[PDB]
Design a protein around this ligand. Structure first.
Ligand code: B12
Ligand code: SF4
Ligand code: SF4
Ligand code: NI
Ligand code: NI
Lengths: 313, 442, 126, 531
């Protein structure tokens, strides 16, 4: 037989997040994920851990047992996570600014983000709520306060793409996440809008959507496949940015993960089901072409790191 | 598929069972039906179209009626290109070098882990029985698994032809998988499996040696093969699997056009979470039959959910049947709940409603097989469609309850409905589905 | 009809049409020029439908002047050479040029009757 | 009140202090534009396009002030003054009227101020769409069979429109006897802008239907002189009058269509005489000219088609090419609609496809069309043919209502509709044909399209024309018969071409359809073999 050696004319761009020796690079691959036989994968996929500013009341009991003594303080929580598990990056989700739930002024969340970012050396990803109107002001304040650390701002959706673009990349030299929803054409549109604003492909990453396994997962898989094939096979310049997928945002809120053993006695250990859901979702999206994943349970982080190490090496 | 229509006699005699010659041409073009069903086919064109209709990847059938599974038959490397035809199957590994307690525990796990998710029964499909050195214990294990009552297909993994000759008749009538062909014993294995058209497992070290062995077997005349991509490590196994699939598909090579069997229990050293990760990987990356050390709900739920998602047809997603669905045995007087045709949406909503244990009639309109807002933003989910379906479905079967609940994430639809259903009491309920059980309770 | 019926007498072996044609824009009557000048008129100031924007650019010195290039060809001059050289020199010196007749047709053949010509031949003000 | 938060910054009493706002624009290019120092032309280009600054020079101007203004002009900032100066259009302007200096500057710098709220007492939101108010709730009613009402959006020169000019001619709804009453309603919206053209007039007009429907208490359905509007009594209580129609229309026209609309004037007419006079003078001529333009547009006159990829969310390889004669196969996107979408929404579904590299005009092959199809479909489809069904045909997504399939025994093509659930001569039903045809796959001999493409001049032009149509459901035939007969009469055939086409009532079977066609003298039996 003849070895299959189809070549690609495209290459995913590289985006650097963080400062110092902990700074991580995303992108650079010229082939499909883990296709070390086809060519070179520019950077290894990065795994990050998720923390909240407020106490995680809705998380499962094992996770609240893991962070029983640090979950009150975001700074202590971030320092504990960094000292114990040493992730590639930390995602600080500002859920206290969610208008539907408890509502907070952008100044308080910006102060919390600054306190967290001035206590850790690992790259920090600041994620807002789902509200675009709140997100614009929140990210303006956060980027003003957390200046000089090259943080990543998530969910710069089209409705506020200018504001998060202006307060982020342009003003305070941060990175941004252009977010679309299970569509390759919408990802192209948001990338083109960011490029026309004056923001290069080296200044933002993409979020083509994320879902838990079993809940619209095939749409995410197909979108990842399509954007990867277009960026590499077609040399589509507007899709050549790295992709970040927040897995624990959706995979940890499903019935299979969040049902206690007393709620479903036949299913078994709640912690095992949570870790299994996280690992399955992250593994699938990593295989489909994501560059960074955000995980909640440290066991999931360890399993995914070993998975990446086994596949790449 | 219009090319084969020229080779057809173009006489719509309807002997094939398909209404026209063009209908037969388009049915066999899609690969659903082979070309041999035309009785009047000209012999030269018959052979030509037997070669032309030949699928790039052969489909292997394993098991009997209630355990019949089809492996392979794929045409593209990505599901968005055309589709993914046959879902991968899972095997639980048993070995004769196991304590009876462990065997009983694994059998009980196979029987216990069995559920239904969106109309598909998720359960362990295969028992992979491996030979570990002792004939008597191997036969005893096979008999114990057969007599345990597990409804699974059988995959006998035994490279020893002497042991296989005695082990095969124990499960011969159940159409098993006979794995173990090597570079030296493939003649005897082909002789063993040739009589009953059993699937034969082929293994070799490296891809080139596997290719040579498959060519040697095909020169013997046997094509019912399941390939072992091999690989001493996870990286090498993944490379071998991907290369086999791409050689078959991109290279248009029929030598590798066979399903693959991947022993994840040996690669992961029985690591449960690594098993889940690699099972997802090979679900997305050409793994036809995945063998695992054990099976529990932590493995089953995400893997089966993802497998159900991946192997849906992109053009025709899953849609629940149109009509009135009875939940918690609804009587004459029971609240009416309306929701879209999308299978995931109905799955979640009916899960919330059934857990509420409140008798609630459910009505499904034709929303185009889309979620509430996706269909709404596309305009296919409006108040006119809900009114049309409520009028036509036959809600009159049960009366004396006019409170109708409507998806809360779409609230703009309210104003029309009260005009289109004057007697009905239209309620725009809560957006989140977790609010459903309490709202039904209160 | 006489011209059309003569097509039957065409000898296609004697036909040679050079593949040399040029796009041109024309139709600049005084009314059309005034309509074009209305674009650069601030609505809050006005007036509209006057030559005032042209007078303004001439008075301010953004345009040095306006020159009319007219006339025929003459075998005493290399055909179209003087027309083209005069027009290019004038527009390079920020003199807007209006053309008529055979000079206008020389400009059309050369390619000066194009919007792109502004960035190819004209000076900064023009 | 001066302050940074109050956006009133005093720089200094000396003229040189104006450099302190100049460096703001300069550093905006350095900081936000990412332009390195020394790239003066790039920085000047940035400040001219990106920084919306302008200069208002009041009082006598020294030579130094004028030279500093030349610096502002060098950065692309227009200079406005109340002094007599050698005016330069768009750059140096004199405005003595201090009451118009702000408006002059905003126009000179192309500055638009967003009206955050619509000055109306009644609530305006998208959630109030479709809330039908009954006779009990209703106060006023316009149009329908009760009286005559019409709406029109027309493009006019800037002089004829006045910004935010809302006037009402005739009585208002306050003079109503408090009983539900009838009175004519004429709505006239004049829009002016630099990028506005006549082809965009219908598009905006359609949005009127939504703009009125978002107001609670009023409902608008219908189009042109078929306007049908109802106003509830609760709107009368809250303080709704006819001027708020104009306020809402102006606000939404400037919001949604700010790209092409600079000035908007709304006129509400209630007089029986003036409404009819304006409908005759303005409405009907534009309706007739729009219909004539829709009728007379052909692929030859235009030199740009339009590509749409909206249906790639479920058909990844599908690209729609829209020509004046070939509609978008969903049936809702036209050539004019695609042009309006491209103008109003860049980086959207609709993009321009130049007519370059013509290869076969009879078949409909262009090199540029193939290049654009290859680009948009991400390489899945490389070469397409616009007018042929058998040779490199266009793909179909799944929104189409009609499917055309080839019938070689009849030497023609049959047509099926979505509402037709019975069988066809071809065998497959619509569902099987839909599964075979849609999904963005090039399938020769089958295509999906709308009801309007049937009577087109380019329908199957590569295989002869629409004379190949040999079977069609009776409802579809009755819907299309007039234009199908017109196009067949132009083609080579007697006008009553609909009668020769078979249908499900006569025969649904191969041999029966063939017998009817050959006994009816169908032209498809006298053409060259279709394949
Ligand atoms: C997957 C997806 C797609 C896929 C798959 C859609 C499908 N067939 O399900 C595809 C590509 C087809 C798609 C297309 C479009 N999509 Co889409 N889609 C999504 C996505 C990512 C998830 C939808 C999903 O899987 N929902 C799962 C089901 C279970 O949710 P559900 O039906 O809403 O059910 C919930 C509730 O309604 C409630 N519920 C359900 N029934 C009932 C009944 C009652 C009585 C009650 C009380 C409650 C209730 O229970 C559920 C809560 O668990 C969302 C983003 C998101 N995270 O929500 C965008 C999203 C919904 N899409 C959106 C849009 C607009 C579209 C398009 C119209 C345009 C586009 N490309 O964005 C197209 C239309 C294509 C077409 N022709 O129809 C928007 C909707 C915005 C809006 N407010 O109008 C979103 C939010 C994306 C965005 N850009 O922001 N989409
Ligand atoms: S059996 Fe063969 S010849 Fe007869 S109708 Fe079917 S395809 Fe045509
Ligand atoms: S069918 Fe209509 S909506 Fe779909 S891509 Fe074509 S023009 Fe766009
Ligand atoms: Ni479509
Ligand atoms: Ni379609």
């Amino acid at each position: 037989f003849k070895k299959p050696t189809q070549k690609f004319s495209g290459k995913i761009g590289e985006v650097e997040i963080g400062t110092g020796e902990k700074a991580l690079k995303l992108g650079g691959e010229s082939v499909l994920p883990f296709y070390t036989f086809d060519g070179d994968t520019g950077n290894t996929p990065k795994v990050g851990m998720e923390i909240l500013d407020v106490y995680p009341e809705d998380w499962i009991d094992p996770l609240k047992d893991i962070y029983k003594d640090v979950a009150k303080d975001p700074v202590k929580w971030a320092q504990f996570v960094e000292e114990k598990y040493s992730p590639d990056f930390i995602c600080l989700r500002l859920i206290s600014a969610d208008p539907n739930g408890t509502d907070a002024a952008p100044e308080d969340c910006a102060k919390t983000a600054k306190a967290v970012v001035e206590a850790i050396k690992t790259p920090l990803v600041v994620a807002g709520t789902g509200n675009h109107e709140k997100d614009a002001k929140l990210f303006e304040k956060v980027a003003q306060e957390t200046e000089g650390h090259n943080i990543l701002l998530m969910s710069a959706v089209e409705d506020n793409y200018k504001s998060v673009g202006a307060a982020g990349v342009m003003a305070y030299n941060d990175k941004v996440v252009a977010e679309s929803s299970v569509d390759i054409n919408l990802a192209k549109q948001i990338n083109i809008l960011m490029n026309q604003l004056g923001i290069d492909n080296t200044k933002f990453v993409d979020n083509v959507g994320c879902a838990a396994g079993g809940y619209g997962y095939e749409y995410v898989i197909s979108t990842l496949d399509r954007v990867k094939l277009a960026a590499l096979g077609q040399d589509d310049k507007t899709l050549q940015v790295p992709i970040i997928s927040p897995v624990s945002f959706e995979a940890c809120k499903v019935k299979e993960a969040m049902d206690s053993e007393e709620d479903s006695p036949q299913w078994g250990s709640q912690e095992d089901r949570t870790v299994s859901m996280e690992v399955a979702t992250a593994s699938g999206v990593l295989a489909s072409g994501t560059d960074a994943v955000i995980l909640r349970h440290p066991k999931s982080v360890e399993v995914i790191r070993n998975f990446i190490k086994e596949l790449l090496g | 598929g219009l090319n084969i229509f020229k080779l057809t006699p173009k006489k719509n005699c309807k002997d094939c069972g398909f209404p026209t010659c063009l209908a037969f041409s388009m049915k066999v073009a899609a690969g659903a039906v082979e070309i041999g069903k035309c009785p009047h086919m000209s012999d030269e064109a018959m052979e030509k179209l037997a070669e032309a209709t030949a699928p790039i990847m052969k489909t292997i059938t394993i098991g009997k009626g209630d355990n019949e599974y089809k492996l392979g038959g794929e045409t593209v490397l990505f599901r968005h290109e055309k589709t993914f035809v046959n879902r991968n199957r899972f095997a639980v590994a048993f070995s004769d070098s196991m304590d009876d307690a462990e065997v009983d525990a694994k059998i009980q796990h196979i029987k216990d882990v069995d559920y239904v998710r969106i109309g598909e029964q998720m359960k362990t499909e295969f028992a992979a029985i491996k030979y570990a050195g002792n004939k008597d214990k191997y036969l005893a294990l096979i008999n114990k698994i057969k007599a345990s009552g597990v409804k699974v297909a059988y995959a006998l993994v035994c490279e020893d032809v002497a042991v296989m000759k005695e082990a095969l008749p124990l499960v011969k009538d159940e159409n098993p998988l006979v794995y173990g062909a090597n570079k030296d014993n493939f003649k005897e294995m082909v002789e063993l499996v040739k009589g009953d058209k059993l699937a034969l497992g082929v293994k070799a070290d490296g891809l080139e040696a596997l290719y040579g062995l498959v060519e040697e077997i095909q020169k013997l005349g046997y094509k019912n093969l399941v390939l072992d991509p091999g690989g001493k490590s996870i990286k090498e196994a993944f490379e071998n699997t991907v290369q086999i699939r791409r050689i078959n598909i991109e290279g248009q090579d029929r030598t590798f056009g066979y399903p693959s069997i991947i022993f994840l229990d040996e690669l992961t050293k029985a690591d449960k979470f690594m098993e889940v990760a690699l099972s997802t990987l090979f679900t997305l990356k050409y793994g036809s039959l995945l063998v695992l050390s054990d099976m529990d709900y932590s493995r089953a739920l995400p893997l089966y959910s993802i497998r159900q998602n991946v192997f849906t047809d992109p053009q025709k997603p899953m849609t629940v049947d149109l009509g009135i669905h009875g939940i918690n045995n609804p009587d004459e007087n029971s609240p009416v709940l309306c929701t879209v045709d999308f299978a995931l949406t109905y799955f979640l909503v009916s899960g919330e409603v059934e857990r509420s244990k409140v008798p609630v009639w459910m009505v499904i309109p034709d929303a185009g097989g889309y979620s509430v807002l996706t269909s709404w933003a596309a305009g296919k989910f409006t108040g006119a469609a809900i009114a049309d379906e409520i009028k036509k479905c036959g809600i009159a079967e049960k009366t004396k309850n006019r409170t109708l609940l409507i998806p809360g994430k779409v609230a703009v639809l309210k104003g029309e409905l009260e005009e289109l259903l004057p007697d009905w009491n239209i309620v725009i309920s809560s957006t989140e589905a977790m609010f459903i059980p309490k709202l039904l309770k209160e | 009809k006489e011209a059309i019926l003569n097509f039957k007498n065409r000898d296609q072996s004697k036909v040679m049409i050079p593949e040399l044609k040029c796009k041109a824009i024309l139709g600049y009557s005084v009314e059309e020029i005034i309509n074009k000048l209305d674009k650069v008129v601030n609505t809050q100031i006005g007036p509209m439908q006057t030559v005032k924007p042209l007078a303004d650019v001439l008075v301010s010195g953004v345009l040095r002047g306006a020159a009319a290039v007219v006339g025929c060809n003459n075998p005493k001059v290399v055909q179209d050479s003087a027309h083209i050289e005069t027009i290019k020199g004038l527009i390079k010196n920020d003199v807007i040029v209006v053309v008529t007749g055979c000079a206008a047709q020389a400009a059309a053949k050369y390619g000066l009757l194009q919007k792109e010509a502004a960035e190819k031949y004209a000076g900064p003000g023009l | 009140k001066m302050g940074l938060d109050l956006r009133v910054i005093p720089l200094g009493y000396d003229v040189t202090s104006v450099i302190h706002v100049v460096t703001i624009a300069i550093r905006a290019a350095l900081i936000f534009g990412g332009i390195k120092g020394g790239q003066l032309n790039d920085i000047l280009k940035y400040t001219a396009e990106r920084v919306p600054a302008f200069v208002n020079a009041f009082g006598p101007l020294s030579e130094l002030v004028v030279s500093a203004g030349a610096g502002a002009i060098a950065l692309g900032f227009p200079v406005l003054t109340d002094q007599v100066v050698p005016e330069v259009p768009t750059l140096l302007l004199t405005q003595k009227d201090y009451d118009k200096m702000v408006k002059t500057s905003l126009e000179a710098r192309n500055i638009k101020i967003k009206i955050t709220e619509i000055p109306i007492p009644v609530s305006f939101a998208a959630a109030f769409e479709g809330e039908r108010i009954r006779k009990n709730d209703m106060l006023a009613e316009f149009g329908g069979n009760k009286t005559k009402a019409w709406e029109l959006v027309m493009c006019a020169d800037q002089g004829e429109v006045e910004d935010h000019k809302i006037e009402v001619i005739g009585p208002d709804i306050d003079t109503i006897d408090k009983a539900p009453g009838r009175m004519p309603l004429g709505m006239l919206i004049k829009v002016s802008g630099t990028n506005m053209q006549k082809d965009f007039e219908p598009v905006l007009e359609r949005r009127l239907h939504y703009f009125l429907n978002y107001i609670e208490g009023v409902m608008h359905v219908g189009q042109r002189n078929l306007t049908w509007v109802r106003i509830g009594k609760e709107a009368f209580e809250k303080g709704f009058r006819l001027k708020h129609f104009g306020e809402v229309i102006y606000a939404k026209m400037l919001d949604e269509f700010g790209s092409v609309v600079d000035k908007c004037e709304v006129t509400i007419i209630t007089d029986p005489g003036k409404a009819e006079e304006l409908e005759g003078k303005y409405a009907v001529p534009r309706y007739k000219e729009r219909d004539a333009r829709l009728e007379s547009l052909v692929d030859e006159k235009v030199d740009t088609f339009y590509s749409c990829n909206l249906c790639q969310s479920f058909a990844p390889a599908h690209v729609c090419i829209v020509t004046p004669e070939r509609l978008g196969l969903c049936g809702a996107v036209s050539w004019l609609d695609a042009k309006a979408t491209l103008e109003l929404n860049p980086t959207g579904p609709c993009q321009a496809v130049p007519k370059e590299g013509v290869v076969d005009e009879n078949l409909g092959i262009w090199e540029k069309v193939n290049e654009t199809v290859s680009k948009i479909s991400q390489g899945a489809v490389t070469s397409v043919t616009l007018y042929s069904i058998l040779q490199d045909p266009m793909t179909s997504c799944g929104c189409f209502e009609c499917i055309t399939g080839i019938m070689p025994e009849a030497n023609g093509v049959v047509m099926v509709n979505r509402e037709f659930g019975a069988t066809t001569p071809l065998g497959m039903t619509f569902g099987e044909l839909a599964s075979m045809t849609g999904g963005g796959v090039q399938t020769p001999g089958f295509m999906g399209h709308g009801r309007q493409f049937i009577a087109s001049k380019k329908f199957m032009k590569g295989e002869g024309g629409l004379g190949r149509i040999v079977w069609m459901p009776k409802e579809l035939k009755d819907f299309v018969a007039e234009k199908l007969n017109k196009t067949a009469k132009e083609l080579y055939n007697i006008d009553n071409f609909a009668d020769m086409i078979c249908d499900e009532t006569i025969a649904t079977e191969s041999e029966e359809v063939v017998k009817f066609l050959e006994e009816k003298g169908h032209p498809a039996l006298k053409m060259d073999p279709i394949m």
